[PDB]
């Protein structure tokens, strides 16, 4: 009687070469249709909003200016409680922890995710 779910992330840091793409996966378990739910990511230090999906649409006017036109939320299997944060033209300033979360009405769990931005050369 409790849709109360645990949120799960990588479990190990995610790697990416500078100036590249990055994908951060996050899902809820048991998985369920997270289409109506609120999903989002925070950039660890000062909880800046990296990306926010709510009421079916991406809330663009609600993300930190530093991230505009740099993210995306893969929604292929959202009905499975699965999504992924994709980021373009990576930079070191993207190195560090992130925080993903799902809000099921008055319920809301989160998972910590971390990104390693390594230097090619």
């Amino acid at each position: 009687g409790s849709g109360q779910f645990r949120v799960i992330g990588p479990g190990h840091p995610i790697r990416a070469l500078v100036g590249d793409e990055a994908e951060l996966p996050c899902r809820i378990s048991p998985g369920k249709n997270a289409t109506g739910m609120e999903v989002g990511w925070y950039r660890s230090p000062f909880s800046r909003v990296v990306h926010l999906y709510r009421n079916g649409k991406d809330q663009d006017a609600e993300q930190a200016p530093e991230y505009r036109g740099r993210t995306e939320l893969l929604k292929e299997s959202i009905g499975e409680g699965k999504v992924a944060l994709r980021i373009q033209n990576v930079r070191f300033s993207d190195e560090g922890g992130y925080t993903c979360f799902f809000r099921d009405h008055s319920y809301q769990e989160e998972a910590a995710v971390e990104l390693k931005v390594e230097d090619p050369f």
Partner: antibody, heavy 118, light 114 residues
Framework: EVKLHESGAGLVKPGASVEISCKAT????????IEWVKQRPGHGLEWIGE????????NYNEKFKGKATFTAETSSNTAYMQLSSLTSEDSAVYYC???????????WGQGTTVTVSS | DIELTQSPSSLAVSAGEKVTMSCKSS????????????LAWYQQKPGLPPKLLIY???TRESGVPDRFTGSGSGTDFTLTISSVQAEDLAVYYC?????????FGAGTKLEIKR
């Protein structure tokens, strides 16, 4: 089994500060957003904001920004609200509500009264 | 901010009559992912807190008697009490339960004439 209870000084001097507290029992206190609602006779309900105990996340109503301030201590399953520079407008019955996976605010505390007056 | 207008501001009926309450929102209250209108109706009897009757524009909370029904969509909803009861005397508030800052209507007071 889920039930909230409110409490806090019922009489305070204008231009001071009151910290009404909300105690919750019957659940994993840290994963449900708590809502704070003001209500006064010549009016209906007012939504002040909410807070996610544990994460420590906050969302306030624009008009209450600066006026109100939330926090909580997992140690006691108590969420707090501190209204400041109290005014007669600040005279009312404040509630705190919580919810579940399908509804936000299905549970309401008994509410406590607060009157501002020197 | 979304504003909610309730009407009548109050009405009186006798036990057993059908009653219908209005609440008209200034904005849409539809979540696209749910394809559901996030509106709620609360009953408030004198002295205690508000009771939640229906959420999502038309879904009954556990326990609430079936004589209570909330329909609507778009910016216009309505609460209907099939056959009024004495204990149904109270104040009824409707609430934007989808967009911040949350907002409640002015309420519709229901008197019981006899």
């Amino acid at each position: 089994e889920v039930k909230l209870h409110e409490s806090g000084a019922g009489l305070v001097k204008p231009g001071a500060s009151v910290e009404i507290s909300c105690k919750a029992t019957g659940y994993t206190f840290s994963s449900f957003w708590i809502e704070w609602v003001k209500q006064r006779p010549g009016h209906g309900l007012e939504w002040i904001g909410e807070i996610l105990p544990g994460r420590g996340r906050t969302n306030y109503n624009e008009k209450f920004k600066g006026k109100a301030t939330f926090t909580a201590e997992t140690s006691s399953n108590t969420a707090y609200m501190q209204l400041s520079s109290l005014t007669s407008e600040d005279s009312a019955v404040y509630y705190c509500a919580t919810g579940n996976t399908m509804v936000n605010m299905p549970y309401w505390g008994q509410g406590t009264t607060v009157t501002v007056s020197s | 901010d979304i504003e909610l207008t309730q009407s009548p501001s109050s009405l009186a009926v006798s036990a057993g009559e059908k009653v219908t309450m209005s609440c008209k929102s200034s904005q849409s209250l539809l979540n696209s992912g749910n394809q559901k209108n996030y509106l709620a109706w609360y009953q408030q009897k004198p002295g205690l807190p508000p009771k939640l009757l229906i959420y999502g524009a038309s879904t009954r909370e556990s326990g609430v008697p079936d004589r209570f029904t909330g329909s609507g969509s778009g910016t216009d909803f309505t609460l209907t009490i099939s056959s009024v009861q004495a204990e149904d005397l109270a104040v009824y508030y409707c609430q934007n339960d989808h967009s911040y800052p949350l907002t409640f209507g002015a309420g519709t007071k229901l008197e019981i004439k006899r």
